[PDB]
């Protein structure tokens, strides 16, 4: 079945996957493209000199190890598999509580 | 395919590593070379007699159990490797 | 042994289950039926 095929593909992808190493660990840098879809800017406080903003922060890179050529559909996995992939260590320098 | 050789290097580093023992437990006193980079001196709360400060707290010791020999000189690893090795338990006295 | 047969059922139920794929991943569209019961409309 198609479901078993996708499960086999995903299990093959995550097998032998080292999360400690970024894509191209011994080669050129990886390019991480950013998008932001600002939902709202809640409060602009003059007494704390801060401002709260809610955003849809999206990043897009290219990992060659997560490449499959069996199924032709763009897989959408549960949000818990992100604890088993490599994701860039992005941080906001001037944030206080997020 | 540097991924496989670097995975082998990492697994050799953590193979036989005890993160409950400081580096040089028997014949040495560990020397932690610290450093601070204050990115922003926060607002001094006069009511609470406190103050906030946002820092880049840097530490650096010498661990002889993490010597390797590969193509790269410095392994810029992920922040999740830092929990499998020994790291000093610096706490702020105040 | 009723707990034993129910444990066997629950173990057979998650045997080979992948919780990363929605039901009918490439063969259908999932249909989530929703409902809300407001216990208190806050301030
Ligand atoms: C700070 O952020 C990190 C990374 O975003 C969080 O690490 C994640 O923590 C969760 C919960 O501890 C981990 O999930 C656990 O996975 C194990 C399997 O190893 C499973 O047995 C547990 O039941 C649980 O599901 C998750 O793997 C981990 N992610 C990474 C990349 O390490 C951390 O929890 C955050 N801390 C706080 C205080 O927000
Ligand atoms: C996957 O996404 C790309 C870019 O959004 C799109 O061009 C392509 O058609 C998608 N694949 C499928 C099967 O829809």
């Amino acid at each position: 079945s198609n479901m078993s095929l996708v499960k086999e593909t995903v299990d093959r992808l995550l097998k032998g996957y080292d999360i400690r190493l970024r894509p191209d660990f011994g080669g050129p840098p990886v390019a991480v493209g950013m998008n932001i879809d600002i939902a709202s800017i809640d409060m602009v406080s003059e007494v704390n000199m801060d401002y709260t903003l809610t955003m849809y922060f999206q990043q897009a890179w290219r990992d060659k190890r997560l490449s499959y050529n069996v199924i032709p559909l763009n897989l959408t996995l549960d949000n818990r598999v992100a604890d088993q992939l490599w994701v860039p260590d992005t941080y906001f320098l001037n944030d206080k509580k997020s | 395919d540097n991924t496989t050789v670097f995975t082998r290097i990492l697994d050799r580093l953590l193979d036989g590593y005890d993160n409950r023992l400081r580096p040089g437990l028997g014949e040495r006193v560990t020397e932690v070379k610290t450093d601070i980079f204050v990115t922003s001196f926060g607002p001094v709360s006069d009511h609470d007699m406190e103050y906030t400060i946002d820092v880049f707290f840097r530490q650096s010791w010498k661990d002889e159990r993490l010597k390797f020999k590969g193509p790269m000189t410095v392994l810029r690893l992920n922040n999740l490797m830092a929990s499998k090795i020994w790291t000093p338990d610096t706490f702020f006295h105040n």
Side-chain angles (χ1 to χ4, degrees), chain A residues 2 10-11 14-15 17 20 32 40 44 46 50 55 70-71 73 79 81 83 87 92 95-96:
Chain A
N2 204 314
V10 171
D11 281 358
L14 301 186
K15 175 172 310 183
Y17 190 94
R20 286 91 50 99
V32 172
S40 87
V44 188
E46 285 93 17
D50 63 38
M55 81 194 76
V70 191
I71 50 181
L73 55 90
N79 53 78
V81 75
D83 303 298
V87 296
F92 309 90
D95 74 329
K96 311 165 71 169

Side-chain angles (χ1 to χ4, degrees), chain A:
Chain A
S1 87
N2 204 314
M3 177 81 66
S4 174
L5 180 56
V6 174
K7 176 195 172 192
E8 270 196 10
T9 290
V10 171
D11 281 358
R12 170 171 63 78
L13 290 189
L14 301 186
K15 175 172 310 183
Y17 190 94
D18 216 340
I19 178 175
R20 286 91 50 99
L21 324 175
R22 64 161 178 89
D24 317 318
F25 188 44
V30 57
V32 172
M34 307 288 188
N35 279 322
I36 298 187
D37 181 327
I38 308 185
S40 87
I41 296 181
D42 296 333
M43 60 204 48
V44 188
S45 200
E46 285 93 17
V47 309
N48 314 316
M49 301 288 183
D50 63 38
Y51 75 100
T52 289
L53 75 163
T54 289
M55 81 194 76
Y56 296 74
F57 185 55
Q58 307 166 17
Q59 312 156 86
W61 59 99
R62 198 192 191 284
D63 213 328
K64 286 178 176 57
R65 302 167 301 190
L66 314 164
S67 87
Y68 57 94
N69 48 15
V70 191
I71 50 181
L73 55 90
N74 300 349
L75 274 179
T76 307
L77 306 169
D78 193 18
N79 53 78
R80 276 179 298 169
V81 75
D83 303 298
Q84 314 165 34
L85 306 191
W86 175 91
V87 296
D89 199 329
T90 291
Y91 81 100
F92 309 90
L93 183 85
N94 67 345
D95 74 329
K96 311 165 71 169
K97 182 178 178 182
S98 82

Side-chain angles (χ1 to χ4, degrees), chain B residues 38-68:
Chain B
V38 179
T39 43
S40 87
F41 202 103
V44 172
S45 197
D46 212 337
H47 213 87
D48 301 330
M49 277 181 176
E50 83 164 6
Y51 74 98
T52 300
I53 177 172
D54 179 314
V55 295
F56 282 165
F57 194 47
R58 319 198 175 111
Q59 294 161 106
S60 159
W61 55 104
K62 176 72 179 292
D63 209 345
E64 72 271 15
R65 304 170 305 192
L66 297 168
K67 279 189 170 184
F68 59 90

